[PDB]
Symmetry: C2
Amino acid sequence: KYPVLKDQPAEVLFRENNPTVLECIIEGNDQGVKYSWKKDGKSYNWQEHNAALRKDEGSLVFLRPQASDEGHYQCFAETPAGVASSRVISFRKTYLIASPAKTHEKTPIEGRPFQLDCVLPNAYPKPLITWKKRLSGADPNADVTDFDRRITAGPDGNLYFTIVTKEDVSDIYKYVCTAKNAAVDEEVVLVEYEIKGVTKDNSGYKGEPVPQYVSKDMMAKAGDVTMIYCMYGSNPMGYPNYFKNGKDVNGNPEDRITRHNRTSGKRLLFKTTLPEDEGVYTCEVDNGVGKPQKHSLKLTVVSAPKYEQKPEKVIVVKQGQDVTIPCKVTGLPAPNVVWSHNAKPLSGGRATVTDSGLVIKGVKNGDKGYYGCRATNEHGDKYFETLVQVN
Amino acid sequence: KYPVLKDQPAEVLFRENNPTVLECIIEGNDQGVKYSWKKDGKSYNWQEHNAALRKDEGSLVFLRPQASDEGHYQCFAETPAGVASSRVISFRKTYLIASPAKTHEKTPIEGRPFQLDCVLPNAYPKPLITWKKRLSGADPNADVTDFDRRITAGPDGNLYFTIVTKEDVSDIYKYVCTAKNAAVDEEVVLVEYEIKGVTKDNSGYKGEPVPQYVSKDMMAKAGDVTMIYCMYGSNPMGYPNYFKNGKDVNGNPEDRITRHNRTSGKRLLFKTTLPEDEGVYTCEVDNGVGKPQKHSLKLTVVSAPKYEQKPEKVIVVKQGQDVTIPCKVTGLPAPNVVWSHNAKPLSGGRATVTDSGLVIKGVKNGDKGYYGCRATNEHGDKYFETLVQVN
C-alpha cells in the first residue's frame, strides 16, 4: 500500500552473547527509505558497534549483545512521505541465576502445619516456580506425580502442607522445586527435599488455624488473572470463606470468580479481572478448634493505556479539506497523550488537539507526514501513528 | 600466545528466520588475521548474502537464516603463521511439524493389555515424547507424568498398559502425548485420549505374558545411552530377567547397566554404552500363568573417531630439527585419517606419514603452518590441527 511501519513488541529480551534482533519492517512501498535507530534518546551508531541491520528492513541485529546493550531503542524510517517512528522498544537481558541444587532431609512433627522453603533465584523476567513429587532414578519426562489437597504452593514459591502426615513420607520421592524462564530451555532445579519420617507431637498442637501465607493488598491489571491466597495451617483442614466488602463470593467451580479451583479454598481465583472487582476482600477460616481467623485484602485493578480508537494506518486527503486523525485513549490512572508529527512535537499552527483526535483545518502541503499518538502511564507506554498523505 | 582457532561444535541448529551464529574465534594473538568461510566446498560470500561477521572474530552470524542456508560450513583464518581451519560445521534447520491435536475416546476391554498410540511429528532433531495424565481445566499443579506400574511408554512413543483396569478410567483426566525439541519453546500436543469406560473380556485371556513391544537387533554408538525394551502384557505383572550371552545382567539401581530404572524391568538401561557391551541379550518373562516367554537380538557397538592422541595446540621448533606432529585415532569401523598443511593436502616432500603422527625431517621455513588431522567414518567427522611455528 503506502510506506508504513509494521507494529512491534513492547519489550525484547536477550540472552547475553546470543544474537537477537530488534524488528523494524516497512509495510507497503519501501523504496528509498533510510532507517536510523536512537537508543536511550541519544543517537545510535550501529555501524560502530557490534551490530548489523537486516537487509531489506530497518531491523537492528545485535551480533553479541552485552549487559551494557540494555536500553530503550526507537526506530525511525525516513520515507518520501515523512518520518515514520516505531514505539519505544525496551531491550533487556534475560537470565536465571541460582546456586547449585542442595538436597535436604526433613523429619517434621506429625499432624501439624509444615512448609518446604524454596530458594528463589536472581532472574528476569520473574521465573515460574513449580513444585513436584520427583520419583528418583526415573526419566525427567516421567517422574512427576500429584500432591494431596493438604499441599499447595503459595505465590512466594514455598510448598505448604496444612498438616503433615505419615503419608507425606517416602524413601523414593523427592520434593523438588524448579524454576524456568525465558533465559533457559528446560527448568532449573533450585532445591530438593526428602521427608524420611515424622516425629510425634508432645506439646499437643490444638489444631487452631494459623497463618501460613496470606495475600496482602495488591494491584491487578484488568483482563489479567488474579489470585488471592488464604493458606492457614489447621487440624482438621478448614475451608476458607471469601467475602467482597461483606457479600459472599465463593461462587462455583465455573464462575468468573471462585474459591473452587482445586486448592481446597486456599485460593480465590478470578479467571479474568475486571474494574468492578475492586474492593476489600475478606476471608475467614473456621475449623471448630479455637478462635476463627479473619484477613483483609484490598484488590485494586489498574490498567495500561487502552486505545478506544487506534489511529488509522493511513489517511489520504486533498489539499484544502480538513483532516481529523482520530485517537481516543483510556486507562487507570489516566494515560497522558503526547502528539508528534514526523517524529517531533506539534506547533500550534492549525493543529487543534481534541480528546477524540487531532484536527488540522487548512491542510497545506507541509502538513503531510506521520502523526503519532503516544499514550502513557506507570503501567505501559504505547504508540501508534497515522500517515497523513495529502495531494 | 600464537594464533590458534578455538574448538567448535559438530553441528549448529537454527530456527528458521531466527538470528544464529556459527562461531570462529582465534585464541591468542589475533593480529592481522583475515577470516573466510566456505560452504559446501565452494566459497561463501557473506557480504553478498544476509549475514555479517562478528566483530573481533571470524564468527559468521546469519541475520535471518532460511531453509536454503542449511549446509556444511568451514572457516579459515589467514594468519602470519599460515592458514588455520575449523572443523567442517554442519548447519541444519530445526523444526517440529504436527497435525492439530485430535481428542479420541476409548473403551477398552478390562483385564487385557492396552496401548494408546501417539502420532509422532515430522521434526529434527528427534523430539522428546512425554505422556501425562492431564486434569481438565484449572490445575494448580504439574501434569502427572508418573502412571501406575502397569503403564510405561515405549521407545516408539506409545503408552503401554500391561493390562488395562477400571482404575484407568476417568472423566476428568486425559491421556496426553506431547513432543518438544529445539524448534519450539514449550511442548506441542500431538494427540489426546480419554478412557471413559471398559468392556468385559469375552475371550478368557488367562494372564500369560504376551509381547507388547520388544527391541529387535540394534546398533549403538559407544558413549551413548542404549535401551533394550521387553514389554509384555501379563497378569500378574511380571519382572523380566536380563542375560548377556547367558550370564545374569540385571545389576542394581546404580550400576552402568541395569533393569532397575523405574520401568519395572521393562527396560535394560546402559547409562553409557561401551564396545564390551556387544553381545546377544536375552530376556525372559515368567508370571506363573502359562508358559514363560524368551527374546533375543544382536547389540552391535560402533563408535565415532576417538583421538588417542590429540594433536598439540602448538609446536615451536628450530630450523633444522625434525618435528613430529603426533596423532593417533581409533574407531569402529576404523576411521580414515586425512592430513592437511595450511588448508591443503600434503606434498611428498619431507612429510612422512606414520600411524602415530606426521614426521617432517629437514625442517625448513616453508614447513611452518597449521597441520590438520581429520579422522572420519560413518559415525563422525572430527578435526584438530597443530600449528607448527619454526624459527
